[PDB]
Design a protein around this ligand. Structure first.
Ligand code: CDL
Ligand code: LMT
Ligand code: LMT
Lengths: 52, 226, 112, 82, 160, 108, 63
């Protein structure tokens, strides 16, 4: 779970440096990664239904 | 067939849209009269401002030919400024119709070259001032986007404030002048970023023992600080 | 009396303007919104989903995220209709002909 | 006895000599808090304690600034993450 | 051999679990596993950072004035999957150097692989003079050392 | 010969005049503006109660257009402002139910 | 005060040592987590690695 948290933090850092607030895909990307943070302690099968 | 019969009620009923129209058409429906906005405040050109510039109070030089008569800010305003709305306040520092320094390029490659060297942006040169409503709409949209980006962020309202100050100072047309106003909020955001990182990642230091003369006087209170 | 507002005080002037005979809702000034990105964003999302331009234009709808509506239009409906009737009959309320309805509305909204 | 010229000293005395008991009490309380902190440190702690600091909230689940520890859900071969 | 690979991965996870359970003070209990882990390494070409972890654990309880920095960086570079990017050069020369592997040189902003000595310089009047002279030459500022007013005194340098 | 256009532009000018006179503290001018605001239009009068009960897509179109022309939120307490807003919205509703609005830049 | 200061000097020395080693252990923890993430990511690399000569996504013609 610690490494999952680290992976999600890496994704968020990379994507936030890449996409600025004027970018349209920023809000969806940040929302999806926030859902991953919400659903770290889960399996991919259970996480898909919620983050789709 | 006359043109525009029902379209000038301001003329039929002697309604002035502004005190300048009232004074011109002699409707005399403004009790306080009209102090005309002079021409040097109605239009003009961009100028240098700092006293540590040699060409201070001189017009900015461009690749194209431009009128060098400058916009003069209101340095000695009257005491009573009956309209203290943004509409009447903005005229003291910028012209509402924009500056008179815009180009009409004879070719497209001149435009390209000016942009490439950093001497032209249409955002900057073919544009008016923004109205208070426009500023507020922009600020509120930006605030919504930032809140969506992260609610649990302490630097949120500081970022919103630097955006607000840039918009109010009309950074589209006077970016250097506006940055001079907004870099303080940028600095505060820069501080809040570290204060948040150090709270998230626990960073602290060994504080030294209390000094012998922490209190200047024995009867003085030593107010405790976190 | 009305003194000049320097440029540093304009951000507070935008959201706490001075008093006028026709003021706005200062509590709702942070809620006024009008998105210039609404239709571009809609088109981008639909074309990314895979629709055609005609399908996108048929599915397009105007923004609901705009400035909210005045509640007076739903609460003071009959009073406003009567005031507008009076105005249409009496030439815009010249020489105080719709004062009845306007005063009723003002009292209802203000309550001292 | 007294005089108008001694109003400074009179006021200062009247207002400050009653505070000396409280000042000494504050000093004693500080020494006792230091003693207890040092006894706790000798007993042992998971994370360290800063002696001359106002508040030390750090524990297994809490940072040295009162927030939850990041990456503290699992266990680590080298033991504590700090 | 995938059966053996999975068995060794399970053994390594078991070793990590035991080590975490015991803690970094009591680490001499898990000398059981080195017997098998070294064989795993020799068989699969794998490394498990055993010596580095043990040396770090031993050092941090009886620390060096360096505060075990070389042990820390050694463990960090061993635990990388593809191998260490940064290593400590082995020398007959007195001072050791930090060195960078060539196959990862394109990831780092360096002209060469030598990232300098692994110990700080020693205090020397001569080195300080050298550095100051070099900086003066690079700056090339006419005006350095000019004294427009000096307190009138028999001493050459009044005060200092 | 162009009554809809003419009355629209006149209404907008009178709204601007009302706002300016409010900023400059001019009750005479702003009451003149209120009085000159085309209250004798049968089409808009007929469309007012229709707007007050419309719902959904038409209402959203008209709200979008009104927020374009006049995005500032009027004070809920000032009936003159409320009434001018209602009048402008009814005018736009009439225009929309005769010929609907096409607000998107993408169109063909 | 001198006795207290001697004791405090000893305690502060020990505390400085502990603080340095604690911060370095935290650093190592984070780096080891990064290494685990990288080890998992390298499994997603296709057989034979990446074609570093070409673009991953070709997003237009070249006529
Ligand atoms: C009548 C009264 C008696 C008159 C004599 C009094 C003066 C005696 C001393 C004379 C010798 C001075 C040295 C001259 C050589 C050149 C050097 C020099 O000039 O520099 C000093 C100074 C300039 O300083 P500078 O330009 O920066 O030069 C470099 C530094 O000075 C020096 O370099 P530095 O900065 O690195 O040195 C720092 C440090 C280095 O030195 C030290 O650190 C130690 C120095 C102190 C030594 C202590 C004594 C040693 C004791 C050891 C033994 C102990 C045990 C035994 C004793 C126990 C004690 C009981 O300290 C000093 O050097 C201090 C120097 C003191 C200057 C003299 C101060 C007195 C000013 C004149 C007073 C006038 C009184 C009223 C006159 C009334 C007459 C009408 O020039 C003067 O001092 C001018 C002296 C002029 C004498 C005037 C006499 C009056 C004549 C009447 C004329 C009428 C017109 C006057 C106008 C008004 C009239 C009404
Ligand atoms: C040739 C013979 C040579 C003989 C040498 C004699 C050595 C004398 C050394 C005494 C030095 C003591 O130094 C002084 O002591 C006190 C406590 O006692 C310290 O402590 C004091 O200040 C610090 C903070 O400022 C705190 O600990 C505390 O507020 C106070 O007690 C001082 O920080 C230190 O400056
Ligand atoms: C009955 C108990 C003992 C009675 C005697 C009371 C007299 C004490 C007064 C001495 C002056 C105290 O002034 C100051 O207070 C405390 C120690 O007390 C120290 O303060 C510092 O060390 C103490 C450790 O005890 C910490 O709790 C404190 O956070 C830190 O600021 C300072 O180094 C000292 O300069």
């Amino acid at each position: 779970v610690d490494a999952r948290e680290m992976k999600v933090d890496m994704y968020e850092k990379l994507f936030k440096q890449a996409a600025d607030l004027e970018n349209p895909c920023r809000m969806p990307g940040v929302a999806y990664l926030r859902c991953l943070r919400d659903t770290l302690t889960e399996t991919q099968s259970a996480r898909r239904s919620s983050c789709l | 067939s006359i043109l525009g019969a029902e379209a000038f009620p301001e003329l039929l009923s002697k309604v002035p849209l502004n005190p300048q129209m009232d004074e011109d058409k002699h409707f005399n429906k403004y009790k306080w009269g009209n102090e005309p906005i002079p021409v040097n405040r109605r239009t003009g050109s961009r100028m240098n401002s700092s006293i540590y510039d040699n060409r201070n109070h001189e017009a900015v030089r461009h690749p194209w030919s431009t009128d060098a008569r400058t916009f003069h800010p209101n340095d000695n305003p009257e005491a009573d400024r009956i309209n203290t709305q943004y509409s009447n306040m903005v005229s003291d520092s910028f012209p509402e119709g924009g500056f008179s320094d815009a180009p009409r390029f004879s070719s497209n490659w001149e435009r390209l070259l000016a942009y490439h060297h950093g001497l032209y942006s249409p955002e900057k040169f073919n544009s008016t001032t923004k109205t208070a409503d426009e500023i507020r709409l922009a600020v509120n949209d930006f605030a919504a986007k930032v809140h969506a980006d992260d609610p649990k962020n302490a630097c949120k309202y500081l970022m919103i404030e630097e955006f607000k100050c840039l918009q109010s100072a009309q950074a589209r047309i006077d970016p250097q002048g506006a940055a001079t106003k907004c870099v303080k909020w940028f600095n505060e955001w820069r501080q809040c970023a570290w204060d948040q990182e150090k709270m998230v990642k626990g960073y602290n230091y060994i504080e030294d023992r209390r000094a012998r003369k922490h209190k200047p006087y024995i009867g003085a209170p030593d107010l405790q600080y976190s | 009396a009305a003194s000049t507002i320097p440029i540093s005080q304009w951000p507070s002037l935008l959201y706490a303007p001075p008093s006028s005979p026709a003021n706005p809702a200062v509590e709702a000034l942070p809620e006024m919104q009008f998105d210039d990105l609404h239709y571009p964003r809609q088109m981008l999302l639909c074309r990314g989903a895979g629709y055609s331009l005609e399908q996108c234009n048929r599915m397009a709808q105007p923004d609901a995220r705009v400035t909210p509506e005045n509640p007076a239009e739903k609460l003071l409906k009959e009073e406003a209709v009567a005031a507008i009737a009076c105005l249409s009959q009496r030439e815009g309320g010249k020489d105080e002909q719709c004062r009845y309805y306007i005063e009723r509305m003002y009292k209802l909204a203000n309550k001292e | 006895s007294t005089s108008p010229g001694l109003a400074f000293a009179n006021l200062t005395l009247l207002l400050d000599v009653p505070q000396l008991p409280a000042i000494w009490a504050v000093n004693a309380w500080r020494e006792l808090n230091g003693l207890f902190t040092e006894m706790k440190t000798l007993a042992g702690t998971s994370d360290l304690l800063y002696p001359s600091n106002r508040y030390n909230p750090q524990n297994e689940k809490t940072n040295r600034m009162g927030r939850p520890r990041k990456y503290n859900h699992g266990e680590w071969m080298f033991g504590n993450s700090y | 051999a995938p059966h053996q690979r999975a068995a060794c991965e399970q053994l390594h996870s078991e070793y990590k679990q035991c080590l975490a359970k015991n803690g970094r003070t009591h680490f001499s209990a898990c000398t059981d596993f080195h017997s098998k882990l070294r064989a795993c390494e020799n068989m699969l070409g794998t490394s498990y950072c055993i010596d580095e972890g043990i040396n770090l654990m031993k050092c941090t309880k009886n620390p060096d004035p360096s505060f075990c920095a070389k042990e820390f960086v050694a463990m960090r570079e061993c635990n990388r999957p593809q191998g260490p990017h940064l290593v400590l050069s082995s020398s007959p020369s007195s001072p050791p150097h930090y060195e960078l592997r060539p196959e990862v040189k394109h990831l780092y902003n360096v002209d060469s692989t030598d990232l300098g000595s692994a110990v700080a310089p020693v205090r020397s009047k001569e080195q300080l003079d050298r550095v100051a002279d070099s900086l003066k030459a690079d700056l090339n500022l006419p005006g350095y050392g000019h004294i427009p007013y000096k307190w009138e005194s028999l001493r050459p340098n009044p005060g200092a | 010969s162009s009554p809809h256009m003419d009355r629209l532009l006149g209404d907008l000018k009178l709204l601007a005049a009302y706002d300016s006179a409010a900023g400059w503290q001019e009750p005479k001018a702003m009451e003149s503006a209120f009085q000159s605001l085309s209250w004798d239009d049968a089409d808009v009068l007929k469309a007012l109660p229709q707007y007050l009960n419309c719902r959904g897509e038409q209402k959203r179109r008209v709200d979008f257009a009104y927020a374009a022309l006049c995005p500032r939120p009027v004070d809920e307490k000032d009936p003159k402002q409320t009434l001018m807003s209602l009048w402008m919205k009814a005018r736009l509703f009439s225009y929309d139910q005769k010929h609907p609005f096409v607000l998107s830049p993408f169109a063909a | 005060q001198g006795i207290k200061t001697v004791y405090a000097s000893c305690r502060y020395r020990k505390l400085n040592e502990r603080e340095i080693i604690s911060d370095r252990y935290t650093w190592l923890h984070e780096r080891m987590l990064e290494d685990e993430v990288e080890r998992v990511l390298l499994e997603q690399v296709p057989a034979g690695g990446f074609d570093k000569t070409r673009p991953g996504l070709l997003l237009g013609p070249s006529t």
